[PDB]
Structure formats: C-alpha cells, structure tokens
C-alpha cells in the first residue's frame, strides 16, 4: 500500500558530500511530514531532520544543523537529504519516515503530533578515511577428528575497513550451527570478526569446511579452508 | 529520554511493563527490520504514571520480542527525541556454554601479532565472566568480547572473547586458558603452545 523507499547512501570520504532520496508511493505530501532518523550500528534511533513538503518548513537536530539541508520536490513526491562536512560520526542506516500533519496541528499542537506510521527499509552511509580489506585467518578445528564429539572451528577476519564484512560457510551450504559475530573496532582503528561452525569431529578429514569472506568496499572476496592443524 | 528496563527477559502471554522517563509514542524494531509504529498518546496499552510513560503489553506473543523505542516530539524548536532503548528477550531454561579455545594460526603469527579467541556457544542466560590467563596472569586490557543476538529456534547466545598479543609476547610464554564463569560453576578451556 504505502510505499516509502530510500537511496543514494554510499561510501564518502570525510569533509565529503552526499544526498539522499526518499520516494513516495500511496499517499500525499503535504498531508504528511517526512522525517530523516539514523541508526548507528549497533546503537540506537537518533532523529537528523524532517520537513513538511507542501509548506517547506524545516527542522534539524542541533549535531547537524549548519551542515547537512532537508528539501522535498512537490513534483515527483521525493524528499532529500543532502549532506555536507562530513565526519566519521555521521555513519549510519539512514530511515525516512512519515506521520500525519496539519498547518494548525503542526504550528501549534507539535507536542501532539500523530506518530511515524511508516518507515523505509533504510539507506546506508559510509563515511571511510581508508578502505582497508581483511586479512582472514583459519580458527583450526578443536578437536582430532577421534575426538569423537562436537568440533568447533572458525575464521578470523581482521583489519579492514569500513563495514561491513558478510560471512558464509561453504559458499552457504553450511548455515546450521553458524554464528557470525558482530564486527568490533579495534585499538587500530580496524574492525574484527569472528566466524564459527559446529560440525561432527568425524566430518573432519572427509568433509572440508571453507568460509567465503566479502567486503563489498574494497571489491574483495577471500575463500579460507580450515584444515585439522595435524 | 531514558528507558527503564534496558533490558528484560519474559515469557510468552506474560504481563510485560517498560517505562519511560505529555505525549509519547512507542515502536517496535526486530533486527534487521526498520521502526514499526506500535501507539501514540491489541495487547499493547499505554500509560502515564506521574510524569513518566508506561507502554504494557498483555500476552506477549512470539513476534514481540523485540527492542522498544520511546518517542516523543518537542514542541519548542520542533525537535524530535528518541529512548536509549529497551530490549525484551525469551527467558528460557540456564545452558551451559559449550567452551572452545584456538591458538593462533601460523600464518598470523608470520605477520607478527597473536589472536588468541575463546567461544561461549549456545548458552543461557546472557551474564557471564570471561578471563584469560596466560601462565596463570591474568590478563586485563588485552582482550574484546562480541555476543550475538537471541537464536531464533534456541532462544540462547553465542559469545567470543578475543586476546590479542604481539607474536613475540605469545612465544615467550606456554600455558593460554580461558575462563567461563555462570553462577556457581566455571569452565576453563587451555592449550600448551606447540602442543
Ligand atoms: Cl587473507
Ligand atoms: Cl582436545
Ligand atoms: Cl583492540
Ligand atoms: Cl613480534
Ligand atoms: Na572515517
Ligand atoms: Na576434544
Ligand atoms: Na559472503
Ligand atoms: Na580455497
Ligand atoms: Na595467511
Ligand atoms: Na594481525
Ligand atoms: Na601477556
């Protein structure tokens, strides 16, 4: 029914630029307020800035006031985001939401404003100083495949950058018992990443186990097998 | 605004209360999933205690179990501000970690650093204690830790601690140990370097 769909993010060096769009698709501006909210990775909703497109009337949170502009064209019923000066804070999912509105509701009566009924998927803004692909080292199989159990075994992948980094197990034929771990920003500034499979101890020696690393920023894909380490 | 709970564990058809520090609104986001708007101001009810606001679930299905964000407009300066978030998980039976430790590989250790990473699989509930010792030292400063989100079909979490040492550091030194600590027991999972 309705429809809201965002995109332009992108990587974006700092002091860079970038501007987003949100598409509209099942309703009317102007009877509607869009609203520009980002989610930090791992954290929480932060509101950046919103609009009401008949009017034109702006708002921005004060981290961003002076450097990134809301606009809307009435024409096509797309709303922007244009983003300038910036910084490696300003790294997020970047949703554009809806609420109702009224010239009266909204000059006087914003306090009791009907909420953000619908809400796109998200758009994605990178801001890197270096792209830096990942280095990605075998966790060889705990067990000797007499052990006769559960083994565990893994892949490291360390020491690139920017997010993200996408994981999978024999190009995704091993899904079951698979944990991927959220990546964590090391002291280097370089993010980190861990992988890990459960399988049978006696698989191993018969059954080989790869996994298939994708870091989308730097075009690299590395392919590790994880052997029994004697 | 601040959220109360910040966490929560519940059952499903349990009676489920998160605060919030005149109008509020409440979504509901799952992971990977966008906001979805749940009530402004079903089984989900608001309130107004004094000058903080409730948001009350009945009977909790299976498909609320997920993060809670309180919302609220400012009327000066027309600003909009969020909660730091309340997250409600399946409470489940205890589960013991499966513990499993892993030197470093050797074609790190050319380059010149050692990850030492410890695995917490398929454990309940989230609160645990991960120490390193390295000759019987314990470690401190020197190591990460990352748990994923509440399994789908389990209900439990997986962990990993990560110890990082120079290459030079881990070839001085033999015995590398991983603690698990839950409640009244630990678990500690070891290797000699070199076997
Ligand atoms: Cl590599
Ligand atoms: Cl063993
Ligand atoms: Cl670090
Ligand atoms: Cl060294
Ligand atoms: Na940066
Ligand atoms: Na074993
Ligand atoms: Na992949
Ligand atoms: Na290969
Ligand atoms: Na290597
Ligand atoms: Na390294
Ligand atoms: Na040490």
């Known amino acids: 029914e309705v429809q809201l769909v965002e995109s332009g993010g992108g990587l974006v060096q700092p002091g860079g630029s970038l501007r987003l769009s949100c598409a509209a698709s099942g309703f009317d501006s102007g009877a509607y307020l869009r609203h520009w909210v980002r989610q930090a990775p791992g954290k929480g909703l932060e509101w950046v800035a919103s609009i009401y497109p008949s009017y034109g009337y702006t708002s921005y949170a004060d981290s961003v006031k002076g450097r990134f502009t809301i606009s809307a064209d009435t024409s096509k019923n797309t709303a922007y985001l244009q983003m300038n000066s910036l910084r490696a804070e300003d790294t997020a999912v970047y949703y554009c939401?809806?609420?109702?509105?009224?010239?009266?509701?909204?000059?006087?009566?914003?306090?009791?404003?009907?909420?953000?009924?619908?809400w796109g998927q998200g758009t994605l803004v990178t801001v890197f100083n270096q792209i830096k692909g990942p280095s990605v080292f075998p966790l060889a199989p705990s067990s000797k495949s007499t052990s006769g159990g559960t083994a565990a075994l893994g892949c490291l992948v360390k020491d690139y950058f920017p997010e993200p980094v996408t994981v999978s197990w024999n190009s995704g034929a091993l899904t079951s018992g698979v944990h991927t771990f959220p990546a964590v920003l090391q002291s280097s500034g370089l993010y980190s990443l861990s992988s890990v499979v459960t399988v049978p101890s006696s698989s191993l020696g018969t059954q080989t186990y790869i996994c298939n690393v994708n870091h989308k920023p730097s075009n690299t894909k590395v392919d590790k097998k994880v052997e029994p380490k004697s | 605004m601040t959220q109360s709970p910040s966490s929560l564990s519940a059952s499903v058809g349990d009676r489920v209360t998160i605060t919030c520090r005149?109008?509020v609104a409440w979504y509901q986001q799952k992971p990977g999933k966008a906001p979805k708007l749940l009530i402004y101001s079903s089984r989900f009810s608001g309130s107004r205690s004094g000058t903080d606001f409730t948001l009350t679930i009945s009977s909790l299905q299976p498909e609320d179990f997920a993060t809670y964000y309180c919302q609220q407009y400012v009327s000066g300066g027309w600003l909009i501000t969020f909660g730091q978030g309340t997250k409600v998980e399946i409470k489940r039976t205890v589960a013991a970690p499966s513990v499993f430790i892993f030197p470093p590989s050797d074609s790190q250790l050319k380059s010149g650093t050692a990850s030492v990473v410890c695995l917490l699989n398929n454990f309940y509930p989230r609160e645990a204690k991960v120490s390193w010792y390295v000759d019987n030292a314990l470690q401190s400063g020197n190591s990460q830790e990352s748990v994923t989100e509440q399994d789908s079909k389990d209900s439990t979490y997986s962990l990993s601690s990560t110890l990082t040492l120079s290459k030079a550091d881990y070839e001085k030194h033999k015995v590398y140990a991983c603690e698990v600590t839950q409640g009244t027991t630990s678990v500690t999972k070891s290797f000699n370097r070199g076997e």
């Open positions: 939401a809806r609420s109702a509105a009224s010239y009266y509701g909204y000059w006087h009566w914003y306090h009791f404003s009907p909420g953000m009924d619908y």
């Open positions: 005149s109008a």
